[PDB]
């Protein structure tokens, strides 16, 4: 199962073969044996393993212990597992014998120069030059290095390495080249890679160990496809490779680096390869523990920021604030994982105009990569539309990193470049949904995942006008139809206070909400099929819908469109019907959520938001702790 | 495992749902049930199947036979397996009951309009909307239709169908649309496909059955991505799809066609898809039975044509002749297979200048497709360099259609476009070899497969200078060293007659042939690894090599470079050393080949060929009978 070479010898003059450690070499001859050959012996220098074997069977046997009956169907294998100290310091001698004369008929001498050449980066073990998925898989992982680790950088753009810890983001690659030095006066050692892969990653050799930035010499890049390793350190050269791109429509995600020994007296005689896989971008669903909460602070945002602050302080989350409102629409905080340094990465939306500067200015710290996709020939659904489900099992397949959720229309959608990127990540197969019926059309407007210690660890919450129908009808059956919805609130336009009886007896509103629930039910069945969830995991949240056109906006603050930080969720305060001094919508929300251990804090956001068609989740972003499940053993 | 719909009803007014035959429909309600509901009954029109089932378990049970205790966790499924004869001719009625009053509390009525819509082409059986490989696989096959079946055509270029049997090359696609006619006054039926797939195939509707060419109306093409089926024939519309491209670097080979029912009062409510796979181009190795032999006839080709004729008449082969010599370098005759019409297809080389006109002029008959690949920014190895091995097993994988064999260099080759095409065929994974050492550098110069009823059904024959060393040395050991090689031949340049002693005692020639055999041995080991052959299947043919530069040409006529037609092979007549009135090279060739049942006829081609660096296989092409193994159950 190794490399096979055939080196033929002649009875007239000896040969001077060069072999690689561990590799087998078949030994045969040019021309015929002596005229009366009946037997033969073979001998080898210490450190030279010689085996005899028939060409039919594959059992090997030591060959330097007897006189073998001659047979053209036998073959001799020479292996040197250790490199030579000097040129041709070992040799093989084949003597041909006959029972007639006592002396050998002829000799065949082959001197050997053994060289130990090997290229290895990180053979993930827990094995050819192939990358395979699964728990029984192997292969090296290469990151994309999309951050700014050096204080001077304002990391993929430089052809130099001017940071002392940016190297932590790269992948090592060691080339051992043991053997006689004079051999390298006759033979070349060449590292190389295909030009396509050369445009996707860069390699740096080392010329002074671990201390000098200028010592990390760039050897492979955009135009540099090959390089001659001078063996500056001796018998081992160290390289650092950094990726330049993420898996995309045209890039499968694998890059090959080869080393080759050439005989320029040129003919190559050995080549070794190493295959890296570019680690993909992984999204974090709301079920994971949060790390940093992001929220804006605008000219009239007074208590929304205070509520987000005082409510994220319960889960121990950060509070980075932007001076310029939809901080969940501009960015999605995922990550890219490596066996050495897994770093979070922001994906910046092409929906620009308000926070278009925030990611490239105040989000890529030392360990914070940045990636973005802008189409050539516009986004209307963008990163409110981009969510991710928890790990699921459906259609027989298992999705241990969950699945991506994006919106669109069936007969015609989010831009094709973002779709191609998400589908090319290959680790969270997206599910395109029906969202075109909403005004802005974001997935998080009707769907939200919440952690709950029962059933599957989580509950999928869907907005349902039928749930609000039932709640308002049961309250009519109690007599509270005269309770008013928009009663307690700082008049933002003197919004007229409607009552339960007025809502239930408005034929147009009820029929439109029936249509809305039909849309959400189509999405519900698609979610149950593509995520493998049952009704035990699906909870309907009461929500009615307004409209000023053929598309749908929220009537009262959207209850699913909340901020989920582990055990604590910030929900927009539903300025619904007060029945006993407490909002009955809040009571229903509590009866549905608090039995799951969660704590519901409702935020007044009627004046800052919900009048510009947004809720707390639309104005609050969050990055989360990566999955415990590692992405390489995923078997797509 | 089918499509799931949820249609909600109201106790105030009935609903008018439209359903698809076979599809299940969950029935729920907007709002709550009557205030004192304890039980319920459900009833359905004949032909309406109603089942009750808990939302936890998946056992279904008929629901219209008892009064069920009310439970919100129960669900009712409605299925109509047969289309309706008139709008809303069937209905479901849900009555809500209490033990207090004897009459029903409330009713919920849902009228149903059932439509039977299905798109099917050829579900290969021996099952979703996916194409899977293997004996247990399914899916439709679409050809590329690269021939000229109509007498007027001079078939992928026309947007019309002006042939009566060109339709045999296309694939059928039937759309059944049973149901009430008035429904189609309210609903649209739309066939469609993605624009990428639209550029790869065309679809024609039928407006008059089986007789009129203008009736095969073009409905889907380069710009036409969607079409409205008018139901011109009633409850079933017939379409004919023809492919426009072969699998390539950017084309995986799958095209999807969808049908959709729209409600323009528009909202789609059902979509059905059909996935075709474009059949690839398959090569035929020399082991298969031949059909047609091609050979040129040039201004001084007198007996080579006669020998090819009189030697192909033994296997019952055709004899198409071109008036303009390398007919095996310009074209490769493969085929494309379909469950209805498998047609042979020529692949035209970009090595042009002598026979550049032959394929597009005198090779694409009625059933003979044409495909070609020309690079933007030149071929020096071309279709002498392109061969194919018999079915093999190696690296665990099984290659039942053999593997493709092309030449090149390791450290840098055949053009990248041809490589991408061959690799994208996906059915015969190519093996790139070392051929750069030869003058012209074609695979067939040193390698040829021959049928032999033993071992594996075939023998791989490799040119070997060591075999010629052994033969000439054993003849020296007999005393025939004074036998002359180029003795019997019509002087083409008064080529000097060399003898065995002169050859064996020429140090430069022997060393160069040793180097040549080392190259061929590298290729031999790569072939044994990538094809899984042993020495029992490998036969070495004696062949020496000349040179006028650093590259290698043949010394005497190349013995492997022969024409293999099943049981009969035409070999270039080796004008080698005559020892007993018979060429000893011919005697060795016979001793190696004739024990395999084959019959060896040696052709004098020294004056026509072998002086312009070519042999019989280089001047004779042949197409062969396709494999008995069908390509779809290949599991790549
Ligand atoms: Ca850097
Ligand atoms: Ca960095
Ligand atoms: Ca870093
Ligand atoms: Ca932006
Ligand atoms: Ca998001
Ligand atoms: Ca046609
Ligand atoms: Ca045709
Ligand atoms: Ca035809
Ligand atoms: Ca051509
Ligand atoms: Ca060929
Ligand atoms: Cl000898
Ligand atoms: Cl409900
Ligand atoms: Cl009621
Ligand atoms: Cl040999």
From Swiss-Prot, chains A, B:
Catalytic activity from the UniProt record = L-arginyl-[protein] + H2O = L-citrullyl-[protein] + NH4(+)
Which tissues is this chain's protein expressed in? Hair follicles, and epidermis at very low levels.
Pfam families for the chain: PAD, PAD_M, PAD_N
Name of the featured protein: Protein-arginine deiminase type-3
According to its UniProt record, which protein family does this protein belong to?
Belongs to the protein arginine deiminase family.
Q: What species is given as this protein's source? A: Homo sapiens
Physiological role: Catalyzes the deimination of arginine residues of proteins.
The listed locations are: Cytoplasm
Q: Looking at the record, which disorder is this protein connected with?
A: Uncombable hair syndrome 1: A form of uncombable hair syndrome, a condition characterized by scalp hair that is impossible to comb due to the haphazard arrangement of the hair bundles. A characteristic morphologic feature is a triangular to reniform to heart shape on cross-sections, and a groove, canal or flattening along the entire length of the hair. Most individuals are affected early in childhood and the hair takes on a spun-glass appearance with the hair becoming dry, curly, glossy, lighter in color, and progressively uncombable.
Question: What keywords are assigned to this protein?
Answer: Calcium, Cytoplasm, Disease variant, Hydrolase
